[PDB]
Design an enzyme around this catalytic site. Structure first.
Site, PDB file in Angstrom:
ATOM      1  N   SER A   1       3.226  14.156  22.133  1.00  0.00           N
ATOM      2  CA  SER A   1       2.728  15.526  22.076  1.00  0.00           C
ATOM      3  C   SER A   1       3.003  16.326  23.342  1.00  0.00           C
ATOM      4  CB  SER A   1       1.219  15.539  21.801  1.00  0.00           C
ATOM      5  OG  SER A   1       0.935  15.198  20.453  1.00  0.00           O
TER       6      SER A   1
ATOM      7  N   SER B   1      -3.944  19.719  20.573  1.00  0.00           N
ATOM      8  CA  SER B   1      -2.851  18.846  20.139  1.00  0.00           C
ATOM      9  C   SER B   1      -2.700  18.823  18.613  1.00  0.00           C
ATOM     10  CB  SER B   1      -2.960  17.421  20.712  1.00  0.00           C
ATOM     11  OG  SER B   1      -1.649  16.913  20.937  1.00  0.00           O
TER      12      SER B   1
ATOM     13  N   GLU C   1       6.469  16.542  13.441  1.00  0.00           N
ATOM     14  CA  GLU C   1       5.266  15.734  13.294  1.00  0.00           C
ATOM     15  C   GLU C   1       5.145  15.233  11.857  1.00  0.00           C
ATOM     16  OE1 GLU C   1       3.469  14.838  15.735  1.00  0.00           O
ATOM     17  OE2 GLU C   1       3.628  16.406  17.263  1.00  0.00           O
TER      18      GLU C   1
ATOM     19  N   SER D   1       0.270  10.838  22.998  1.00  0.00           N
ATOM     20  CA  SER D   1       0.259   9.396  22.757  1.00  0.00           C
ATOM     21  C   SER D   1       1.074   9.058  21.533  1.00  0.00           C
ATOM     22  CB  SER D   1      -1.160   8.881  22.598  1.00  0.00           C
ATOM     23  OG  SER D   1      -1.731   9.377  21.415  1.00  0.00           O
TER      24      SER D   1
END
Length: 260
Positions: A42, A102, A138, A209
């Site tokens: 991210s 995020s 994503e 992460s």
């Protein structure tokens, strides 16, 4: 010395640590594995938000543009977007959600707006960053498989680029200020770089992460009564299901700033 302390921290951690500190007081750098590639996870949301900010310089209505949020947009981690399903969010709101929470839907909307991962990468190239690559959207951009160059950059390149974005002239004056405002309002970073700095210092950061216990943070830092710093701390581990190690990022930040 600082190099030995970072090597020792890396050894203790069991993983692979990448650090780049730029001290703008004296234009110096502290580097550790700073030319190796690491999965950004991210932390790449900064580049996507910046690409939209750049586009907005010539399109004054852009940040107000409405974007539909649908069930079909949901991905793995959607803390803000999930509240707006069947409505719209503005591009400014999506940028804030991506940077401060995020939000993965928000990231995908930023990516889609500018033309996709190759367009975010082309923006990086236009800034003089020839290392950054955003390959995927994503949620798949976070797989962080060892040896896989997709969705990676180096600590050196990301520190230099973040300096340009937040302290330099990559963006117009309003747009630079907006990026800084957004990053200073991040809600996700207190356990990472910030945890290794004195309480009084002001930080704008973006964490990330992913697979292989990948644990990252990139920051612009205003120490009390000092010129700002830029710090990138990237960390990844050998085991696919390793747990996050935000403490390692904090320790790295403490090591490289103790000489201040």
């Amino acid at each position: 010395d600082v190099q030995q302390k970072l090597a020792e921290l890396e050894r203790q951690s069991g993983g692979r640590l990448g650090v780049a500190l730029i001290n703008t007081a004296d234009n110096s750098q502290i580097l550790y594995r700073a030319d190796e590639r690491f999965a950004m996870c991210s932390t790449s949301k900064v580049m996507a938000a910046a690409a939209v900010l750049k586009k907005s310089e010539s399109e004054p209505s852009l940040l107000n543009q409405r974007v539909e949020i649908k069930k079909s947009d949901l991905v793995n981690y959607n803390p803000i977007a999930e509240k707006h399903v069947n409505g719209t969010m503005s591009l400014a709101e999506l940028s804030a959600a991506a940077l401060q929470y995020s939000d993965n839907v928000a990231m995908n909307k930023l990516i889609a707006h500018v033309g996709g991962p190759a367009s975010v990468t082309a923006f990086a190239r236009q800034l003089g960053d020839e290392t950054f690559r955003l390959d995927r959207t994503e949620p798949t951009l976070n797989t962080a498989i060892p040896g896989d160059p997709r969705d990676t950059t180096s600590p050196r390149a990301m520190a230099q680029t973040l300096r340009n974005l937040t302290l330099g002239k990559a963006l117009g004056d309003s747009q630079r200020a907006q990026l800084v405002t957004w990053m200073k309002g991040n809600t996700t970073g207190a356990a990472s770089i910030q945890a290794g700095l004195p309480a009084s210092w002001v930080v704008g950061d973006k964490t990330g992460s992913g697979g292989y216990g990948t644990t990252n943070d990139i920051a612009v830092i205003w120490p009390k009564d000092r010129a700002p710093l830029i710090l990138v701390t990237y960390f990844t581990q050998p085991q696919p299901k390793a747990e996050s190690r935000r403490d390692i990022l904090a320790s790295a930040a403490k090591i490289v700033t103790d000489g201040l």
